[model samples]
Target chain A: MKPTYEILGQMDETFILVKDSEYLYFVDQHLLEERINYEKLKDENLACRISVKAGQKLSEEKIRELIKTWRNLENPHVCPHGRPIYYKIPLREIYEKVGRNY
Target chain B: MKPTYEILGQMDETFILVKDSEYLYFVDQHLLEERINYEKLKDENLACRISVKAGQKLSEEKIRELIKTWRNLENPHVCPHGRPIYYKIPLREIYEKVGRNY
Candidate 1:
């Protein structure tokens, strides 16, 4: 997919510079990518049935492996620990959170 | 200074993926770069004093010219509109906002 945003630079690994229409805002790039990855996973990977139920415990190494695998999945909403991969924040809500609306 | 973050591809025109220590996060690449640029301007340039006062208006063309010049300054915390360049957020506070304090 074509990148919709241009890079401003690294700001201590927290936020990034982005512009949308009439204003510039800082966004959580990590959450943004995770949401996109989850959406992509939902759209394309739909055959694997290796269900990882909640309350499952894995070693740190295994968890690392799990994150890598999950990030690559066609459906990666839930991590091996059963945590949600991302949230769907409405654009309007985001604007509100930033103390501005467009 | 070397970039302390890695690009996890562009997630639209809004966000990017970045990892720090044990977690991967997305940041606003545009703001990130701006803050960095501002800091660099602060650290190295220390003589020019073209202060832009608040509550002033400039033409569209002049505004564009102003952004170009200000962004290149040794101290660039205020835009032509006198808005702050960027705000500082504590890393711990960031983790709290993400709901996973680390």
Candidate 2:
């Protein structure tokens, strides 16, 4: 679905009229480059990872502590278009679908 | 689903990659202009309507006779992409759907 977008023509202030062969697609300028940035940010692994000392035993309490510390980071839950970095799924339900007791 | 398509860029010999804002759609060269042509051809109403001198009474014999003559015309059963100019619907079946017995 990702079209190799180029400026064929311009529409209004917000939209850029583009074409691929005979197909004409209207592009909105909002979140235009942000998608590319998000894609690049997600695709890349060059981000510097500063190693932090946690604990050997990972527990619920440790997780809560890590989340508490994680909350302090700038825009931790935010991404382009306020996208959630990740989401939670219940392990119990997941296991249930797999016919396993968790 | 037809994302206002415009060539953001070209892909290869057959495909042209276009995008609208963040969404990109790749269009094939084949049937590319056909779609546009079809759209314009359908949208336009500049075609001349010819006057066919038929009898006042439109009978089944007359209809079949007209169809016989019409078949002689160039690509009578053909339109763009071998499209059927018109299709047949059984009137009896249609009447049954409307809770009427024919």
Q: Evaluated with TM-score, which candidate comes out highest?
A: 1
The DockQ figures for the candidates are 0.06, 0.02
Top candidate when judged by DockQ against the true structure: 1
Instruction: Give the 10-residue window scoring lowest on summed lDDT in candidate 2 chain B.
Output: B46-55
lDDT of each candidate versus the true structure: 0.38, 0.33
- For residues A1-102, write the lDDT of model 1, one tens digit per residue: 112323343334444443334333333334434444445465222312333322343344543343344335554444333434432233344333223333
lDDT of 2 by residue, B1-102 (tens): 123433333322323333343333333322233333343455322221222211223344533343343334443333345423322223333223323334
| Candidate 1 local lDDT, B1-102, one digit each (tens) | 112433333334333333444433433333333444445565212212333322233344544343344335554443233334433233454444434445
The regions of model 1 sitting more than 4 angstroms off are A1-87, A91-102, B1-6, B21-24, B43-102
Which ten contiguous residues of candidate 1 chain A have the minimum total lDDT?
Answer: A44-53
TM-score of 2: 0.21
